[PDB]
Amino acid sequence: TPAFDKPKVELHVHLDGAIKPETILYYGKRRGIALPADTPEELQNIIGMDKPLTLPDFLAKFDYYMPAIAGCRDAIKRIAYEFVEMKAKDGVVYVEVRYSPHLLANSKVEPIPWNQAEGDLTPDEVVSLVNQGLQEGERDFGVKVRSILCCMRHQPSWSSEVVELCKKYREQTVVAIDLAGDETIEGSSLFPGHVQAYAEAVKSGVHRTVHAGEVGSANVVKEAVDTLKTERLGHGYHTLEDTTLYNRLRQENMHFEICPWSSYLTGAWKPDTEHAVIRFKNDQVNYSLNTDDPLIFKSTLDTDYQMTKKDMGFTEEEFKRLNINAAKSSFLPEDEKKELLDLLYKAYR
Ligand SMILES: CCCCCC[C@H]([C@H](C)O)n1cnc2c(N)ncnc21
Ligand SMILES: [Zn+2]
């Protein structure tokens, strides 16, 4: 039985980490692309994980299935559409899905990703394709959907395209910019290509979020907040190692996109310490619960709610509260943000 059987709001989930094994297998076979297994069940076992992995072991997971979807228009649009259906089964009423448009392209994209051969799908089209999938999905399944394009910490040369992409496709599902990738890459937060892109995001009113504090120190979080001027933090668990940064962030009602289950499987969180979210709760912090990558973590939104309910004493009043904050922190136009809030209020009370 669902841990929290009411409407939910999800702000931190990767499109390329939320694909149906079947769909991966389908395109794998239909377009001759080598694939570990050939049975959906076995496929999820190899792609899924249940024990922390090194960055490399983890990254490798993508080389596995990405070549199957990347470059194929049909597949890009489809996984987008199928992702909305997955969310509907979760009882999610609003969701912000993110992904790197360059990682699904095989044209333009400088270092062509996944040892993919030069193709015809550019990053710009990837975005428009995804927009349609997400849009038809919203129509058919009843879930409000917005998207966020990610910049990659190791490739600042893409960041400007990313912000221009968010600018060119706004309203049209794209509501913000993000920064994902290796946090340990020394100085990555300050790469001129990244800071300029977020600076442009500010000049153009493009909402900002950043993956910081998941593995890197509190300083990675600081740079995210003070230099990139982020409005939301992806994870941000290590913020707690700097009480003044933490106190200030609490002061400014900063939003933390928490991924409980995710943190446990990646090692970002060691089961010997009290999970960072438990203190966020005790501190009445502005945060939300997210799946991050259902595919790799073999989960569903419930997985995370089950985890905090069972192992962290999370009440219902808390679930409703954190979801209310998720709505309040959404990148939706105030206009539509109020409408989401009324939905949840009348549904929670
Ligand atoms: C090692 C990551 C390289 C390929 C990234 C694909 C994808 C994007 C950025 O949505 N992504 C999905 N989940 C991700 C995660 N937890 N951390 C970084 N990137 C992630
Ligand atoms: Zn993430």
mmCIF file of C-alpha atoms and ligand atoms in Angstrom:
data_model
loop_
_atom_site.group_PDB
_atom_site.id
_atom_site.type_symbol
_atom_site.label_atom_id
_atom_site.label_comp_id
_atom_site.label_asym_id
_atom_site.label_seq_id
_atom_site.Cartn_x
_atom_site.Cartn_y
_atom_site.Cartn_z
ATOM 1 C CA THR A 1 0.000 0.000 0.000
ATOM 2 C CA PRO A 2 1.263 3.464 -1.070
ATOM 3 C CA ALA A 3 3.049 5.291 1.749
ATOM 4 C CA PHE A 4 1.416 8.594 0.779
ATOM 5 C CA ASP A 5 -1.624 7.950 -1.407
ATOM 6 C CA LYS A 6 -2.326 11.576 -2.365
ATOM 7 C CA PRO A 7 -1.311 13.955 -5.172
ATOM 8 C CA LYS A 8 2.437 14.572 -5.386
ATOM 9 C CA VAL A 9 4.874 17.146 -6.820
ATOM 10 C CA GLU A 10 8.279 16.094 -8.188
ATOM 11 C CA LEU A 11 11.057 18.532 -9.078
ATOM 12 C CA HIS A 12 14.180 16.343 -9.352
ATOM 13 C CA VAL A 13 14.094 13.558 -11.929
ATOM 14 C CA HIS A 14 16.233 12.804 -15.032
ATOM 15 C CA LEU A 15 14.505 11.877 -18.299
ATOM 16 C CA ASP A 16 17.474 9.733 -19.397
ATOM 17 C CA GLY A 17 17.322 7.943 -16.044
ATOM 18 C CA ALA A 18 13.618 7.244 -16.336
ATOM 19 C CA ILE A 19 13.129 5.018 -19.390
ATOM 20 C CA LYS A 20 11.264 1.708 -19.703
ATOM 21 C CA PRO A 21 13.589 -1.257 -20.146
ATOM 22 C CA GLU A 22 11.140 -2.507 -22.798
ATOM 23 C CA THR A 23 11.512 0.744 -24.723
ATOM 24 C CA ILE A 24 15.309 0.515 -24.492
ATOM 25 C CA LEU A 25 15.212 -3.093 -25.681
ATOM 26 C CA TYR A 26 12.734 -2.201 -28.405
ATOM 27 C CA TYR A 27 14.966 0.418 -30.003
ATOM 28 C CA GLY A 28 18.008 -1.665 -29.227
ATOM 29 C CA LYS A 29 16.756 -4.489 -31.416
ATOM 30 C CA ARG A 30 14.961 -2.342 -34.043
ATOM 31 C CA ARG A 31 18.064 -0.341 -34.889
ATOM 32 C CA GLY A 32 20.814 -2.902 -34.377
ATOM 33 C CA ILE A 33 22.500 -1.634 -31.217
ATOM 34 C CA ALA A 34 24.485 -4.026 -29.017
ATOM 35 C CA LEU A 35 22.765 -4.539 -25.657
ATOM 36 C CA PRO A 36 23.945 -6.362 -22.470
ATOM 37 C CA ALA A 37 20.807 -8.486 -22.184
ATOM 38 C CA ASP A 38 17.737 -9.088 -24.360
ATOM 39 C CA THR A 39 15.075 -9.619 -21.710
ATOM 40 C CA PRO A 40 13.456 -6.597 -20.000
ATOM 41 C CA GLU A 41 13.730 -8.234 -16.561
ATOM 42 C CA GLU A 42 17.429 -9.094 -16.876
ATOM 43 C CA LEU A 43 18.089 -5.711 -18.457
ATOM 44 C CA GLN A 44 16.839 -3.846 -15.386
ATOM 45 C CA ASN A 45 18.972 -6.077 -13.184
ATOM 46 C CA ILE A 46 22.161 -5.055 -14.963
ATOM 47 C CA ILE A 47 21.191 -1.387 -15.310
ATOM 48 C CA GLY A 48 19.715 -1.221 -11.838
ATOM 49 C CA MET A 49 21.883 -1.069 -8.745
ATOM 50 C CA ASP A 50 21.537 -1.997 -5.091
ATOM 51 C CA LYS A 51 25.016 -1.163 -3.864
ATOM 52 C CA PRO A 52 27.090 2.017 -4.086
ATOM 53 C CA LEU A 53 29.241 2.241 -7.227
ATOM 54 C CA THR A 54 32.324 4.177 -8.264
ATOM 55 C CA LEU A 55 31.628 7.157 -10.530
ATOM 56 C CA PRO A 56 33.014 5.132 -13.495
ATOM 57 C CA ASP A 57 30.921 2.017 -12.741
ATOM 58 C CA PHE A 58 27.920 4.366 -12.440
ATOM 59 C CA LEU A 59 28.623 6.373 -15.583
ATOM 60 C CA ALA A 60 29.081 3.152 -17.552
ATOM 61 C CA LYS A 61 25.408 2.437 -16.877
ATOM 62 C CA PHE A 62 24.554 5.116 -19.438
ATOM 63 C CA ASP A 63 26.897 3.911 -22.191
ATOM 64 C CA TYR A 64 24.831 0.731 -21.919
ATOM 65 C CA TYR A 65 21.369 2.037 -22.859
ATOM 66 C CA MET A 66 21.870 5.576 -24.168
ATOM 67 C CA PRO A 67 23.170 4.639 -27.642
ATOM 68 C CA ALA A 68 19.791 2.965 -28.085
ATOM 69 C CA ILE A 69 17.739 6.144 -27.572
ATOM 70 C CA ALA A 70 20.257 8.851 -28.489
ATOM 71 C CA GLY A 71 20.097 9.955 -32.112
ATOM 72 C CA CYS A 72 16.706 8.359 -32.770
ATOM 73 C CA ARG A 73 13.890 10.898 -33.148
ATOM 74 C CA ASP A 74 11.226 8.226 -32.601
ATOM 75 C CA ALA A 75 12.851 7.168 -29.314
ATOM 76 C CA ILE A 76 13.442 10.675 -27.962
ATOM 77 C CA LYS A 77 9.786 11.644 -28.348
ATOM 78 C CA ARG A 78 8.610 8.265 -27.040
ATOM 79 C CA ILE A 79 10.537 8.127 -23.758
ATOM 80 C CA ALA A 80 9.322 11.681 -23.103
ATOM 81 C CA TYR A 81 5.728 10.602 -23.672
ATOM 82 C CA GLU A 82 6.181 7.396 -21.662
ATOM 83 C CA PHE A 83 7.737 9.329 -18.774
ATOM 84 C CA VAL A 84 4.513 11.274 -18.209
ATOM 85 C CA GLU A 85 2.598 8.000 -18.021
ATOM 86 C CA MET A 86 5.087 6.720 -15.406
ATOM 87 C CA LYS A 87 4.481 9.855 -13.334
ATOM 88 C CA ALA A 88 0.710 9.507 -13.579
ATOM 89 C CA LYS A 89 0.969 6.055 -12.019
ATOM 90 C CA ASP A 90 2.816 7.811 -9.183
ATOM 91 C CA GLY A 91 -0.063 10.159 -8.475
ATOM 92 C CA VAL A 92 2.125 13.112 -9.400
ATOM 93 C CA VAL A 93 0.127 16.182 -10.485
ATOM 94 C CA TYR A 94 3.099 18.346 -11.480
ATOM 95 C CA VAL A 95 6.627 17.357 -12.417
ATOM 96 C CA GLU A 96 9.774 19.037 -13.709
ATOM 97 C CA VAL A 97 11.760 16.569 -15.747
ATOM 98 C CA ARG A 98 15.398 17.306 -16.644
ATOM 99 C CA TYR A 99 18.003 16.085 -19.114
ATOM 100 C CA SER A 100 20.969 17.144 -21.242
ATOM 101 C CA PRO A 101 19.777 17.752 -24.827
ATOM 102 C CA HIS A 102 23.323 17.245 -26.082
ATOM 103 C CA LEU A 103 23.459 13.769 -24.569
ATOM 104 C CA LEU A 104 20.672 12.576 -26.860
ATOM 105 C CA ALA A 105 22.033 14.222 -30.004
ATOM 106 C CA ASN A 106 24.421 12.894 -32.654
ATOM 107 C CA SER A 107 24.707 16.090 -34.741
ATOM 108 C CA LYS A 108 26.172 19.446 -33.677
ATOM 109 C CA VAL A 109 27.260 18.292 -30.191
ATOM 110 C CA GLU A 110 31.043 18.738 -30.140
ATOM 111 C CA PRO A 111 32.377 15.622 -28.473
ATOM 112 C CA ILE A 112 29.725 13.306 -29.930
ATOM 113 C CA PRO A 113 28.431 11.350 -26.910
ATOM 114 C CA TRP A 114 28.314 7.601 -26.388
ATOM 115 C CA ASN A 115 30.748 6.800 -29.229
ATOM 116 C CA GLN A 116 27.722 7.491 -31.381
ATOM 117 C CA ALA A 117 28.453 7.962 -35.097
ATOM 118 C CA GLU A 118 27.864 11.420 -36.609
ATOM 119 C CA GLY A 119 24.135 11.634 -37.288
ATOM 120 C CA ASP A 120 21.416 14.181 -38.101
ATOM 121 C CA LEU A 121 19.728 14.834 -34.737
ATOM 122 C CA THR A 122 20.948 18.156 -33.346
ATOM 123 C CA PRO A 123 20.562 19.277 -29.725
ATOM 124 C CA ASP A 124 17.952 21.854 -30.714
ATOM 125 C CA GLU A 125 15.694 19.234 -32.278
ATOM 126 C CA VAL A 126 16.150 16.915 -29.303
ATOM 127 C CA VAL A 127 14.518 19.628 -27.188
ATOM 128 C CA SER A 128 11.596 20.208 -29.546
ATOM 129 C CA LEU A 129 11.059 16.439 -29.808
ATOM 130 C CA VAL A 130 11.004 16.111 -26.036
ATOM 131 C CA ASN A 131 8.583 19.052 -25.852
ATOM 132 C CA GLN A 132 6.048 17.185 -27.980
ATOM 133 C CA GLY A 133 6.340 13.935 -26.069
ATOM 134 C CA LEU A 134 5.954 15.728 -22.746
ATOM 135 C CA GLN A 135 3.076 17.781 -24.134
ATOM 136 C CA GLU A 136 1.112 14.886 -25.671
ATOM 137 C CA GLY A 137 1.789 13.066 -22.407
ATOM 138 C CA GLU A 138 0.291 15.840 -20.295
ATOM 139 C CA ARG A 139 -2.813 15.851 -22.547
ATOM 140 C CA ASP A 140 -3.372 12.106 -22.403
ATOM 141 C CA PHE A 141 -2.383 11.315 -18.825
ATOM 142 C CA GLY A 142 -3.437 14.296 -16.748
ATOM 143 C CA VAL A 143 -0.053 15.362 -15.396
ATOM 144 C CA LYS A 144 1.240 18.923 -15.646
ATOM 145 C CA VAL A 145 4.788 18.751 -17.043
ATOM 146 C CA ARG A 146 7.617 21.237 -17.396
ATOM 147 C CA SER A 147 11.254 20.536 -18.274
ATOM 148 C CA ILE A 148 14.780 21.641 -17.279
ATOM 149 C CA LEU A 149 17.861 21.444 -19.522
ATOM 150 C CA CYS A 150 21.106 20.399 -17.870
ATOM 151 C CA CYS A 151 24.578 21.841 -18.358
ATOM 152 C CA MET A 152 27.391 19.361 -17.751
ATOM 153 C CA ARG A 153 30.102 20.194 -15.240
ATOM 154 C CA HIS A 154 32.739 18.652 -17.529
ATOM 155 C CA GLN A 155 31.676 20.506 -20.688
ATOM 156 C CA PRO A 156 31.378 24.266 -20.233
ATOM 157 C CA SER A 157 31.417 24.651 -24.041
ATOM 158 C CA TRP A 158 27.769 23.547 -24.072
ATOM 159 C CA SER A 159 26.410 25.838 -21.377
ATOM 160 C CA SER A 160 25.645 28.782 -23.669
ATOM 161 C CA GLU A 161 23.662 26.591 -26.045
ATOM 162 C CA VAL A 162 21.818 25.303 -23.001
ATOM 163 C CA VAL A 163 20.782 28.720 -21.783
ATOM 164 C CA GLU A 164 19.844 29.788 -25.321
ATOM 165 C CA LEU A 165 17.862 26.595 -25.625
ATOM 166 C CA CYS A 166 15.958 27.405 -22.388
ATOM 167 C CA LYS A 167 15.363 30.928 -23.702
ATOM 168 C CA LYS A 168 14.139 29.760 -27.104
ATOM 169 C CA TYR A 169 11.813 27.088 -25.711
ATOM 170 C CA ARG A 170 10.322 28.695 -22.638
ATOM 171 C CA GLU A 171 6.672 28.322 -21.670
ATOM 172 C CA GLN A 172 6.996 25.479 -24.208
ATOM 173 C CA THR A 173 7.759 23.217 -21.214
ATOM 174 C CA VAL A 174 11.346 24.445 -20.613
ATOM 175 C CA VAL A 175 11.309 26.452 -17.395
ATOM 176 C CA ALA A 176 14.870 26.354 -16.071
ATOM 177 C CA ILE A 177 18.569 25.508 -16.377
ATOM 178 C CA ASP A 178 20.566 23.017 -14.301
ATOM 179 C CA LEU A 179 24.131 21.858 -13.734
ATOM 180 C CA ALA A 180 24.752 18.120 -13.336
ATOM 181 C CA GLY A 181 27.814 15.872 -13.495
ATOM 182 C CA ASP A 182 30.949 15.128 -11.459
ATOM 183 C CA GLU A 183 31.024 17.468 -8.463
ATOM 184 C CA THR A 184 34.620 16.609 -7.621
ATOM 185 C CA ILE A 185 35.894 18.159 -10.868
ATOM 186 C CA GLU A 186 38.080 20.860 -9.332
ATOM 187 C CA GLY A 187 36.717 24.363 -9.882
ATOM 188 C CA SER A 188 33.925 23.192 -12.191
ATOM 189 C CA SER A 189 31.371 25.454 -10.488
ATOM 190 C CA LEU A 190 33.401 28.463 -11.637
ATOM 191 C CA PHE A 191 34.196 27.410 -15.212
ATOM 192 C CA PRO A 192 33.733 30.671 -17.203
ATOM 193 C CA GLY A 193 31.410 28.803 -19.575
ATOM 194 C CA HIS A 194 29.125 27.810 -16.726
ATOM 195 C CA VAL A 195 29.048 31.088 -14.779
ATOM 196 C CA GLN A 196 28.334 33.087 -17.915
ATOM 197 C CA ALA A 197 25.442 30.801 -18.862
ATOM 198 C CA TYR A 198 23.833 31.192 -15.420
ATOM 199 C CA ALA A 199 24.547 34.906 -15.564
ATOM 200 C CA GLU A 200 22.653 34.969 -18.854
ATOM 201 C CA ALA A 201 19.926 32.885 -17.255
ATOM 202 C CA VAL A 202 19.564 35.772 -14.787
ATOM 203 C CA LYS A 203 19.615 38.423 -17.476
ATOM 204 C CA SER A 204 16.847 36.490 -19.260
ATOM 205 C CA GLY A 205 14.714 35.375 -16.300
ATOM 206 C CA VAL A 206 15.382 31.668 -16.730
ATOM 207 C CA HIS A 207 14.944 29.855 -13.438
ATOM 208 C CA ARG A 208 18.040 28.248 -11.967
ATOM 209 C CA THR A 209 18.760 24.987 -10.149
ATOM 210 C CA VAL A 210 22.073 23.203 -9.581
ATOM 211 C CA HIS A 211 23.248 19.756 -8.436
ATOM 212 C CA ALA A 212 25.480 20.647 -5.452
ATOM 213 C CA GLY A 213 26.155 19.113 -2.058
ATOM 214 C CA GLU A 214 25.419 15.560 -3.167
ATOM 215 C CA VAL A 215 29.084 14.491 -3.002
ATOM 216 C CA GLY A 216 31.148 17.679 -3.056
ATOM 217 C CA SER A 217 31.712 19.859 0.030
ATOM 218 C CA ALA A 218 29.595 22.704 1.392
ATOM 219 C CA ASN A 219 31.774 25.013 -0.653
ATOM 220 C CA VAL A 220 30.410 23.524 -3.864
ATOM 221 C CA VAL A 221 27.038 24.560 -2.487
ATOM 222 C CA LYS A 222 28.333 28.053 -1.647
ATOM 223 C CA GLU A 223 29.614 28.605 -5.169
ATOM 224 C CA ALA A 224 26.247 27.432 -6.511
ATOM 225 C CA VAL A 225 24.409 29.968 -4.340
ATOM 226 C CA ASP A 226 26.740 32.989 -4.520
ATOM 227 C CA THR A 227 28.247 32.662 -7.992
ATOM 228 C CA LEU A 228 25.731 30.782 -10.138
ATOM 229 C CA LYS A 229 22.886 32.481 -8.200
ATOM 230 C CA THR A 230 20.908 29.219 -8.131
ATOM 231 C CA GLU A 231 17.386 29.311 -6.642
ATOM 232 C CA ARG A 232 17.144 25.636 -5.832
ATOM 233 C CA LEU A 233 19.650 22.982 -4.864
ATOM 234 C CA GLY A 234 19.770 19.466 -6.262
ATOM 235 C CA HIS A 235 20.523 17.374 -3.151
ATOM 236 C CA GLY A 236 22.657 19.853 -1.200
ATOM 237 C CA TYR A 237 23.256 17.370 1.614
ATOM 238 C CA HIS A 238 26.764 18.649 2.413
ATOM 239 C CA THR A 239 25.374 22.117 3.132
ATOM 240 C CA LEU A 240 25.231 20.935 6.737
ATOM 241 C CA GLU A 241 29.043 20.939 7.014
ATOM 242 C CA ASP A 242 28.944 24.766 7.080
ATOM 243 C CA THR A 243 26.434 25.967 9.680
ATOM 244 C CA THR A 244 26.520 29.620 8.572
ATOM 245 C CA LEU A 245 25.845 28.626 4.983
ATOM 246 C CA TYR A 246 23.107 26.330 6.250
ATOM 247 C CA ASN A 247 21.639 28.917 8.627
ATOM 248 C CA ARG A 248 21.622 31.492 5.844
ATOM 249 C CA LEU A 249 19.997 29.088 3.380
ATOM 250 C CA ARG A 250 17.328 28.360 5.990
ATOM 251 C CA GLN A 251 17.013 32.081 6.461
ATOM 252 C CA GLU A 252 16.404 32.611 2.760
ATOM 253 C CA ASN A 253 13.992 29.696 2.530
ATOM 254 C CA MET A 254 16.231 27.941 -0.050
ATOM 255 C CA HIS A 255 14.785 24.766 -1.647
ATOM 256 C CA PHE A 256 16.472 21.373 -1.413
ATOM 257 C CA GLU A 257 15.612 18.732 -4.014
ATOM 258 C CA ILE A 258 16.074 15.608 -1.906
ATOM 259 C CA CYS A 259 16.540 12.103 -3.331
ATOM 260 C CA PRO A 260 16.489 9.749 -0.272
ATOM 261 C CA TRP A 261 16.698 6.384 -1.992
ATOM 262 C CA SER A 262 19.096 7.846 -4.558
ATOM 263 C CA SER A 263 21.496 9.092 -1.877
ATOM 264 C CA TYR A 264 21.502 5.690 -0.194
ATOM 265 C CA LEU A 265 22.343 3.721 -3.352
ATOM 266 C CA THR A 266 24.949 6.110 -4.715
ATOM 267 C CA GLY A 267 26.822 6.283 -1.447
ATOM 268 C CA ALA A 268 26.140 10.009 -1.216
ATOM 269 C CA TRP A 269 24.640 8.905 2.091
ATOM 270 C CA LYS A 270 26.166 6.391 4.512
ATOM 271 C CA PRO A 271 23.478 4.479 6.490
ATOM 272 C CA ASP A 272 25.531 5.008 9.673
ATOM 273 C CA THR A 273 24.694 8.690 9.938
ATOM 274 C CA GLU A 274 21.244 10.209 10.284
ATOM 275 C CA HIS A 275 20.035 10.997 6.765
ATOM 276 C CA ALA A 276 20.323 14.697 5.944
ATOM 277 C CA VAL A 277 16.559 14.907 5.234
ATOM 278 C CA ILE A 278 15.721 13.959 8.833
ATOM 279 C CA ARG A 279 17.320 17.155 10.055
ATOM 280 C CA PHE A 280 15.765 19.110 7.231
ATOM 281 C CA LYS A 281 12.472 17.923 8.678
ATOM 282 C CA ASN A 282 13.324 18.678 12.289
ATOM 283 C CA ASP A 283 14.499 22.098 11.068
ATOM 284 C CA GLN A 284 11.327 22.799 9.092
ATOM 285 C CA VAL A 285 13.396 23.205 5.941
ATOM 286 C CA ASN A 286 12.027 23.960 2.482
ATOM 287 C CA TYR A 287 12.543 20.676 0.593
ATOM 288 C CA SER A 288 10.914 17.997 -1.561
ATOM 289 C CA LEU A 289 11.259 14.262 -2.159
ATOM 290 C CA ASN A 290 12.382 13.041 -5.578
ATOM 291 C CA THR A 291 13.277 9.784 -7.370
ATOM 292 C CA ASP A 292 16.153 11.150 -9.483
ATOM 293 C CA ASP A 293 16.558 8.041 -11.695
ATOM 294 C CA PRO A 294 13.837 5.369 -11.387
ATOM 295 C CA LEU A 295 15.678 3.290 -13.997
ATOM 296 C CA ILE A 296 19.054 2.989 -12.251
ATOM 297 C CA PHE A 297 17.641 2.846 -8.728
ATOM 298 C CA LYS A 298 14.856 0.415 -9.728
ATOM 299 C CA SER A 299 12.284 2.624 -8.042
ATOM 300 C CA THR A 300 9.124 4.706 -8.187
ATOM 301 C CA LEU A 301 8.200 7.820 -6.237
ATOM 302 C CA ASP A 302 6.654 5.535 -3.604
ATOM 303 C CA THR A 303 10.043 3.915 -3.014
ATOM 304 C CA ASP A 304 11.274 7.197 -1.516
ATOM 305 C CA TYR A 305 8.132 7.878 0.510
ATOM 306 C CA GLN A 306 8.266 4.321 1.827
ATOM 307 C CA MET A 307 11.882 4.826 2.851
ATOM 308 C CA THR A 308 11.256 7.956 4.896
ATOM 309 C CA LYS A 309 7.999 6.687 6.386
ATOM 310 C CA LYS A 310 9.313 3.273 7.450
ATOM 311 C CA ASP A 311 12.919 4.172 8.341
ATOM 312 C CA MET A 312 12.563 7.831 9.334
ATOM 313 C CA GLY A 313 9.210 8.206 11.074
ATOM 314 C CA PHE A 314 7.843 10.584 8.424
ATOM 315 C CA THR A 315 4.208 11.458 9.138
ATOM 316 C CA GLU A 316 1.478 12.408 6.672
ATOM 317 C CA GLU A 317 1.369 16.026 7.843
ATOM 318 C CA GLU A 318 5.059 16.146 6.846
ATOM 319 C CA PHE A 319 4.470 14.633 3.380
ATOM 320 C CA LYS A 320 1.746 17.210 2.675
ATOM 321 C CA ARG A 321 3.966 19.996 3.946
ATOM 322 C CA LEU A 322 7.004 19.056 1.858
ATOM 323 C CA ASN A 323 4.788 18.708 -1.199
ATOM 324 C CA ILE A 324 3.253 22.097 -0.537
ATOM 325 C CA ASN A 325 6.779 23.525 -0.441
ATOM 326 C CA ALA A 326 7.575 21.698 -3.669
ATOM 327 C CA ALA A 327 4.682 23.484 -5.348
ATOM 328 C CA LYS A 328 5.711 26.806 -3.811
ATOM 329 C CA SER A 329 9.242 26.257 -5.095
ATOM 330 C CA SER A 330 8.196 25.162 -8.608
ATOM 331 C CA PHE A 331 9.463 27.083 -11.660
ATOM 332 C CA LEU A 332 5.873 27.661 -12.762
ATOM 333 C CA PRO A 333 4.657 31.225 -13.413
ATOM 334 C CA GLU A 334 3.175 32.593 -10.141
ATOM 335 C CA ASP A 335 -0.024 32.621 -12.092
ATOM 336 C CA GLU A 336 0.029 28.831 -12.534
ATOM 337 C CA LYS A 337 1.827 28.221 -9.253
ATOM 338 C CA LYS A 338 -1.177 29.484 -7.312
ATOM 339 C CA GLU A 339 -3.399 27.130 -9.324
ATOM 340 C CA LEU A 340 -1.214 24.151 -8.384
ATOM 341 C CA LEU A 341 -1.303 25.234 -4.753
ATOM 342 C CA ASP A 342 -5.093 25.319 -4.672
ATOM 343 C CA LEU A 343 -5.231 21.855 -6.172
ATOM 344 C CA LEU A 344 -2.996 20.425 -3.461
ATOM 345 C CA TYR A 345 -4.635 22.375 -0.637
ATOM 346 C CA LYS A 346 -8.184 21.289 -1.469
ATOM 347 C CA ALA A 347 -6.816 17.760 -1.897
ATOM 348 C CA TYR A 348 -4.720 17.596 1.272
ATOM 349 C CA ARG A 349 -7.402 19.088 3.508
HETATM 350 C C1 LIG B 1 27.728 10.524 -15.098
HETATM 351 C C2 LIG B 1 26.598 11.295 -15.779
HETATM 352 C C3 LIG B 1 26.784 11.515 -17.305
HETATM 353 C C4 LIG B 1 25.494 11.242 -18.104
HETATM 354 C C5 LIG B 1 24.361 11.932 -17.362
HETATM 355 C C6 LIG B 1 22.924 11.656 -17.774
HETATM 356 C C7 LIG B 1 21.870 12.355 -16.893
HETATM 357 C C8 LIG B 1 21.521 13.805 -17.215
HETATM 358 C C9 LIG B 1 22.529 14.916 -16.922
HETATM 359 O O1 LIG B 1 20.184 14.041 -16.856
HETATM 360 N N1 LIG B 1 21.924 12.023 -15.449
HETATM 361 C C10 LIG B 1 20.966 11.213 -14.933
HETATM 362 N N2 LIG B 1 21.163 11.050 -13.606
HETATM 363 C C11 LIG B 1 22.271 11.697 -13.293
HETATM 364 C C12 LIG B 1 22.936 11.830 -12.106
HETATM 365 N N3 LIG B 1 22.514 11.267 -10.948
HETATM 366 N N4 LIG B 1 24.089 12.579 -12.124
HETATM 367 C C13 LIG B 1 24.557 13.166 -13.247
HETATM 368 N N5 LIG B 1 23.933 13.065 -14.440
HETATM 369 C C14 LIG B 1 22.788 12.322 -14.434
HETATM 370 ZN ZN ZN B 2 19.973 14.285 -10.265
#
